[PDB]
Design an enzyme around this catalytic site. Sequence first.
Site, PDB file in Angstrom:
ATOM      1  N   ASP A 538      -1.904   0.833  13.916  1.00  0.00           N
ATOM      2  CA  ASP A 538      -0.876   1.860  13.794  1.00  0.00           C
ATOM      3  C   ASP A 538      -1.353   3.198  14.351  1.00  0.00           C
ATOM      4  OD1 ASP A 538       0.131  -0.425  12.510  1.00  0.00           O
ATOM      5  OD2 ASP A 538       1.232   0.779  10.922  1.00  0.00           O
ATOM      6  N   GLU A 735      -5.695  -5.324   1.681  1.00  0.00           N
ATOM      7  CA  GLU A 735      -5.237  -5.115   3.045  1.00  0.00           C
ATOM      8  C   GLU A 735      -6.388  -4.607   3.903  1.00  0.00           C
ATOM      9  OE1 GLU A 735      -1.614  -2.580   3.246  1.00  0.00           O
ATOM     10  OE2 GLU A 735      -1.719  -2.656   5.448  1.00  0.00           O
TER      11      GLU A 735
HETATM   12  O1  LIG Z   1       8.197  -2.373  -0.158  1.00  0.00           O
HETATM   13  N1  LIG Z   1       7.700  -1.175   0.490  1.00  0.00           N
HETATM   14  O2  LIG Z   1       8.557  -0.168   1.109  1.00  0.00           O
HETATM   15  C1  LIG Z   1       6.297  -0.919   0.521  1.00  0.00           C
HETATM   16  C2  LIG Z   1       5.715  -0.474  -0.703  1.00  0.00           C
HETATM   17  C3  LIG Z   1       4.368  -0.189  -0.748  1.00  0.00           C
HETATM   18  C4  LIG Z   1       3.793   0.228  -2.112  1.00  0.00           C
HETATM   19  N2  LIG Z   1       2.484   0.391  -2.377  1.00  0.00           N
HETATM   20  O3  LIG Z   1       2.420   0.727  -3.666  1.00  0.00           O
HETATM   21  C5  LIG Z   1       3.596   0.763  -4.222  1.00  0.00           C
HETATM   22  C6  LIG Z   1       3.921   1.065  -5.628  1.00  0.00           C
HETATM   23  C7  LIG Z   1       2.945   1.915  -6.400  1.00  0.00           C
HETATM   24  C8  LIG Z   1       2.364   0.624  -7.071  1.00  0.00           C
HETATM   25  C9  LIG Z   1       3.568  -0.128  -6.575  1.00  0.00           C
HETATM   26  N3  LIG Z   1       4.506   0.423  -3.249  1.00  0.00           N
HETATM   27  C10 LIG Z   1       3.522  -0.326   0.413  1.00  0.00           C
HETATM   28  C11 LIG Z   1       4.113  -0.783   1.642  1.00  0.00           C
HETATM   29  C12 LIG Z   1       5.481  -1.065   1.714  1.00  0.00           C
HETATM   30  N4  LIG Z   1       6.092  -1.499   2.964  1.00  0.00           N
HETATM   31  C13 LIG Z   1       5.487  -1.253   4.396  1.00  0.00           C
HETATM   32  C14 LIG Z   1       6.277  -1.995   5.567  1.00  0.00           C
HETATM   33  C15 LIG Z   1       5.356  -2.243   6.924  1.00  0.00           C
HETATM   34  C16 LIG Z   1       3.974  -2.855   6.525  1.00  0.00           C
HETATM   35  C17 LIG Z   1       3.146  -3.351   7.687  1.00  0.00           C
HETATM   36  C18 LIG Z   1       1.682  -3.818   7.287  1.00  0.00           C
HETATM   37  N5  LIG Z   1       1.025  -4.009   8.312  1.00  0.00           N
HETATM   38  C19 LIG Z   1       0.610  -2.773   9.013  1.00  0.00           C
HETATM   39  C20 LIG Z   1      -0.504  -3.166  10.005  1.00  0.00           C
HETATM   40  O4  LIG Z   1      -1.115  -2.055  10.668  1.00  0.00           O
HETATM   41  C21 LIG Z   1       0.084  -3.992  11.046  1.00  0.00           C
HETATM   42  O5  LIG Z   1      -0.991  -4.285  11.988  1.00  0.00           O
HETATM   43  C22 LIG Z   1       0.585  -5.207  10.396  1.00  0.00           C
HETATM   44  O6  LIG Z   1       1.041  -6.171  11.378  1.00  0.00           O
HETATM   45  C23 LIG Z   1       1.642  -4.945   9.296  1.00  0.00           C
HETATM   46  C24 LIG Z   1       1.973  -6.301   8.631  1.00  0.00           C
HETATM   47  O7  LIG Z   1       0.869  -6.737   7.962  1.00  0.00           O
END
Ligand SMILES: O=[N+]([O-])c1cc(-c2noc(C3CCC3)n2)ccc1NCCCCCCN1C[C@H](O)[C@@H](O)[C@H](O)[C@H]1CO
Length: 765
Positions: A538, A735
């Site tokens: 990213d 992750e």
């Molecule tokens: O549901 N959410 O909006 C959401 C919520 C939380 C979250 N964290 O904590 C909490 C609360 C507090 C405790 C619970 N919520 C974290 C993330 C998300 N969504 C992100 C969408 C895109 C992710 C891509 C990951 N990754 C990036 C890499 O760089 C790529 O290379 C790779 O391909 C890609 C796929 O792996």
Amino acid sequence: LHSEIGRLNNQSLLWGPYRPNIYFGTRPRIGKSLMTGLMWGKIESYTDFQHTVRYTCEQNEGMKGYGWDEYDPRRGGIQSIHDIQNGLDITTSFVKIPGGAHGGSWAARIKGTLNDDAPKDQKTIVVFYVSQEGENSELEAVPSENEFGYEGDVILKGRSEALGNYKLVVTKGKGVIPQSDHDLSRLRGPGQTVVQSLTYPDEVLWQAKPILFQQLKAGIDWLVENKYDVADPPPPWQVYLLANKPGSGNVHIVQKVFEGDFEFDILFSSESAGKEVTSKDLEREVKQATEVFGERFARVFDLKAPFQGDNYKKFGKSMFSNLIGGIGYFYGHSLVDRSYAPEYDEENEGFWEDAAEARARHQEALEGPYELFTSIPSRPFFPRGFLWDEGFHLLPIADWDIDLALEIIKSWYNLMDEDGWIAREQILGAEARSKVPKEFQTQYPHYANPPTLFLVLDNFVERLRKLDETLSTASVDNPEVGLEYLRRLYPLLRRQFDWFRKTQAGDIKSYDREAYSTKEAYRWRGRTVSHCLTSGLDDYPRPQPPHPGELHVDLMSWVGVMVKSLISIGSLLGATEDVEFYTKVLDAIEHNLDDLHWSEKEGCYCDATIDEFEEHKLVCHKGYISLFPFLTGLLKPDSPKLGKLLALIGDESELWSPYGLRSLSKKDEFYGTAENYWRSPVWININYLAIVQLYNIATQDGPYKETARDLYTRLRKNIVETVYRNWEETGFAWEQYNPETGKGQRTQHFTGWTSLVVKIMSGHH
Ligand SMILES: O=[N+]([O-])c1cc(-c2noc(C3CCC3)n2)ccc1NCCCCCCN1C[C@H](O)[C@@H](O)[C@H](O)[C@H]1CO
């Protein structure tokens, strides 16, 4: 004979708990069909159940953790859920029973045990929710003998073109069922299993939580209209017990209330098969699936020293099962901007502002439907297909069951459009969309992602050159079945290669740029001031400001990966004319990697731009990007450049932490800045590529054999131990990992390429 394997694969794989977005549910690999899901929650008050009920996956302080202890999509498995909020340790065991013509039968046991903290008389509400989509299909709850609900099993009889005839039973189960002495019991019964049989338009049946709550709210409204009030109120759990109304419909809610521990079964019996599925059958198949799981793991994932210990076996089984257990079937429309606005060609300086303008037109529209069968990075946070992730997911999976992995490749390739594009992020249908802000849904036909799926293909090819058991390797044991698979896919691989060359081309011919080839040069479309999402890394630092003359060394390397793959597969198919073209492209990429990206001054590969003065400039930021020609297997083992990279790899003051390789060097001015996503932390997928390549140098005559052997040994050890220690402490795959502290950070339940760790342990690449 090819379509014989095909038919057997289809029949083998059809049913699964293929809804990894929820704690537990089943669906077959059919867009519009029968789906089940589980819900449970404590009730202690008149208003709590809405906050305590569980259905879709999350991870917060109220959930200790959960995941698959064993799993094979052909056989089933066992999942454990540790829920602090609802004081419950849950087991869900799922097993498949081959037979008939409709993809067989299956069964599940739901076991809940109160933990030590829970009130011993806790009332837990449990719902089994069943829905069926299709015009000419039917499903019916056979009514009970008893007045107000069921003393015994609930039997649903149904039918569809896709499934033929079937029955789905929810057994009486074991555990105390509470009894109300309130007046209400004269109309609602004292307390028993109930069924509501409902119908809604097909496209909303997935909305199980609201559908359920709409029913609970109508029951409460009925209480109010009928003079049940706070002067003398029924107990909470009876207020939240639906009035029994079974019948026919496309939705069936089965509800039970338990006091203390409980268990019940779900028996899906395909009419076209033998006799129907019993609970004794379930227990037997469960025991048998474990035995089979056990024996395959020890053969396929034979952990080598110093990870032979049982602690590491348990660790490996957890990491593996979560990865292959995340496999889902997704179905529906996706959101795509098909304008091909000219601003997306990103030909001007400042292109990101133009592209924003084109995005502000909002020309995106829903299209499809599409289907995907895929593993996913994260049940709680992003339970959907991501393109370069799947390349990593399938490496351990392919070991386990090469035919399954080919299935998933085929599913991904079947999404490719006429130009050669596959969207990097597959958000199929309204259910998938619910989990995703509207602003991040739109896919862009100019956005690539690393072609890491070719890596899996490369593994398949080596294996091809050198009943469930038989099926899992049918595509390598039957060479002609293998070549036929590769034959039908090959055009699509070639399509993707050409799409990269047409859409992600860099500009050599129009600056002061000298290189062996005038052709080979690549730049990721989609870059913003601080990001390059399409690369997968990213926020790894790139030339500032972004520029139409940028060239990205990672992207050229990926193209190198693809040519090499097309050579092997092309050769296997005798596409003689194609193989010669590829051969010349490869030779060119080899020279051009050096001529455009090698920095003698810095001792590593760099991205390039063009200056304020209009000249070619390297921009060097030591980290993953820098090692790309190495990670992607493009350097000859005797290469002085390789040797320089081995020094960069091993250098503690740059990339080498006790915990793995740092995404970015401690020496880089961007170390630990901004969101710090790819600007220091340790990432298992890139570390895995490093490990595989070190092992390759290490097992060949050459000048770096012993250096690579030492680095291989240490990095395997570092990566495995960091992932293991975190799992031990936290229960989670993470992750990424912190290079100063070794702590897992960002997202939990990342299985997810973190699970590559099972292959790292098992070794012999
Ligand atoms: O549901 N959410 O909006 C959401 C919520 C939380 C979250 N964290 O904590 C909490 C609360 C507090 C405790 C619970 N919520 C974290 C993330 C998300 N969504 C992100 C969408 C895109 C992710 C891509 C990951 N990754 C990036 C890499 O760089 C790529 O290379 C790779 O391909 C890609 C796929 O792996």
